[PDB]
From a paper:
Within the last decade, OXA-48 has become one of the most widespread serine β-lactamases. This Ambler class D β-lactamase confers resistance toward penicillins and decreases susceptibility to our last-resort drugs, the carbapenems. However, it is a poor hydrolyzer of extended-spectrum cephalosporins, including ceftazidime. Over the course of 300 generations, we identified seven single variants of OXA-48 (L67F, P68S, F72L, F156C/V, L158P, and G160C).
To investigate substrate binding, all OXA-48 variants were crystalized and soaked with ceftazidime. We were able to solve the crystal structure of L67F to 1.9 Å with four chains (A to D) in the asymmetric unit (space group P212121), which were arranged into two dimers (chains A/C and B/D). Chain C and D carried a hydrolyzed ceftazidime molecule approximately 9 Å away from the active site S70. The R1-group of ceftazidime including the dihydrothiazine ring demonstrated clear electron density (2Fo-Fc); however, no electron density was observed for the R2-ring (top). Here, we found that Q98, R100, D101, W105, V120, P121, Q124, L158, T213, and R214 formed a cryptic pocket outside the active side and that these residues were involved in stabilizing the hydrolyzed ceftazidime molecule (top). D101, Q124, T213, and R214 were found to interact with ceftazidime via H-bonds. R214 was further involved in ionic interactions with two of the carboxylic acid groups of hydrolyzed ceftazidime. We found that K73 was carboxylated and that all first shell residues nicely aligned with the wild-type structure (middle). In the L67F variant, both with and without ceftazidime, L158 and I215 were shifted by 1 to 2 Å, respectively. While in the wild-type structure, the W221 side chain forms a water-mediated H-bond to the backbone nitrogen of M237, in L67F, W221 formed a H-bond to the main chain of F67.
Author numbering:
A (entry chain A), B (entry chain C): 24 to 265
The structure:
Amino acid sequence: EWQENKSWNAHFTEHKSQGVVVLWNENKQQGFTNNLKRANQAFFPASTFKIPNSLIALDLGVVKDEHQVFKWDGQTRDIATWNRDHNLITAMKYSVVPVYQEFARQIGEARMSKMLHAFDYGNEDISGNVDSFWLDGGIRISATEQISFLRKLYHNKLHVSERSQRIVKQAMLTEANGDYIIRAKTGYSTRIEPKIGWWVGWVELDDNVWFFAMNMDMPTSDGLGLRQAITKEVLKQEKIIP
Amino acid sequence: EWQENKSWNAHFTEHKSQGVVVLWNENKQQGFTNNLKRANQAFFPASTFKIPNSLIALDLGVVKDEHQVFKWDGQTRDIATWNRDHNLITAMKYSVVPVYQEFARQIGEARMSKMLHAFDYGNEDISGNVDSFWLDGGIRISATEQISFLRKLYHNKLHVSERSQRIVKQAMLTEANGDYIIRAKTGYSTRIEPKIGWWVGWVELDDNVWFFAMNMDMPTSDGLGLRQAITKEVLKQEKIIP
Ligand SMILES: CC(C)(O/N=C(\C(=O)N[C@H](C(=O)O)[C@@H]1NC(C(=O)O)=C(C[n+]2ccccc2)CS1)c1csc(N)n1)C(=O)O
Ligand SMILES: [Cl-]
Ligand SMILES: [Cl-]
Ligand SMILES: [Cl-]
């Protein structure tokens, strides 16, 4: 059901990188990874948590829709794109933590915890501050657990409205052309070792869907592009994209 | 409110073609075109009619969701991509007329006419075969009328459910990257002169949306790629995309 293919390690070593790519063929219900152990090791979700956080905020009415404007609070942060107004689409695109921190406060701990349990999301532990726990609190998730969660989102099976799931899938849109559509979310965990990068989501084809979840050691910001590049080398090797 | 910019004609004449591009800046509520008259000239919608047809089929339950499979009827036809099973996503991508003819028959004349009147769509005239009138019946629509219809869809303001509009807009997804998202639909009017190609939809930016509608003289199928290419040259010239 899970098969290992150490061939992919070549795309990590070409950049003296280390990590795991997990793929799931939805038609055949078969998984593939370069590293079975690391595929099941849990890490901080970091900004991949904006997927569940969006769903809860939308379902509770904290976010009205994908056009609602969340005004910059006027405090300059050292990510330039955060110091402006955002909606859900742009907050996800630029991983605008302060917008999502405000969502999480309005959601509150009790509603956050029960939604994550209903989602079966990671260790479902929101130990810590409600507005930081996906960064430095108690929550952890593995690449295979990301796949399982994303599969439920793809099929509208999570315990939120169908509308909530459709809107988050819209906001996950990353790339599209006549060959594939990628809906996904990046993440970068920095507060505690090991510093890792995430890319999770799926590739939609005419006749199949390939779910994916990858994380990699990320000692500095200078390699963040490798999350997508290495994932794409594996997708190409497996003939999922040209 | 409307500006004529005949400088865009250079892109048409380069390919010894003729046509019109119409653009609408949603934030500024301002419109632009190379040919005010042809902007208002009504043509067969041809396969751009798959936009309202999709909406109607979804809102009436004729199409349950974007995953329902409409089986190929076994009759081999000249466009290979049509000779295969489809859902709403792939039927729109490959403009699979026979699938949408089935929709139209199930919708029926009465409900089709009522819907297009509720939509204020073109000249609202479905005279002819209930399953061919957008290609050889009485219906006609201009570029400016396409924009007016598309703006209502974008805003979920048409008189069908939000869900129906969300699903159609998902099916219209054509291109997406880090700079823009294009949701659009092509068309080729080939049954009754004059032979014309259509491309209509919108470009989503971080902080604005630019609606577009273009048609061009299209004597042979070999020029069809000009529809998107001339549109993008205009989009590039107006600095809307890089
Ligand atoms: C029939 C044929 C040749 O092509 N069939 C097509 C098709 O692609 N038709 C072309 C079209 O839509 O541009 C032309 N239709 C017209 C036109 O209808 O005016 C004539 C002239 N013509 C007249 C009567 C019957 C067929 C063709 C020539 S084919 C089609 C569309 S939807 C559907 N359910 N089939 C095939 O592949 O077997
Ligand atoms: Cl026909
Ligand atoms: Cl979408
Ligand atoms: Cl077409």
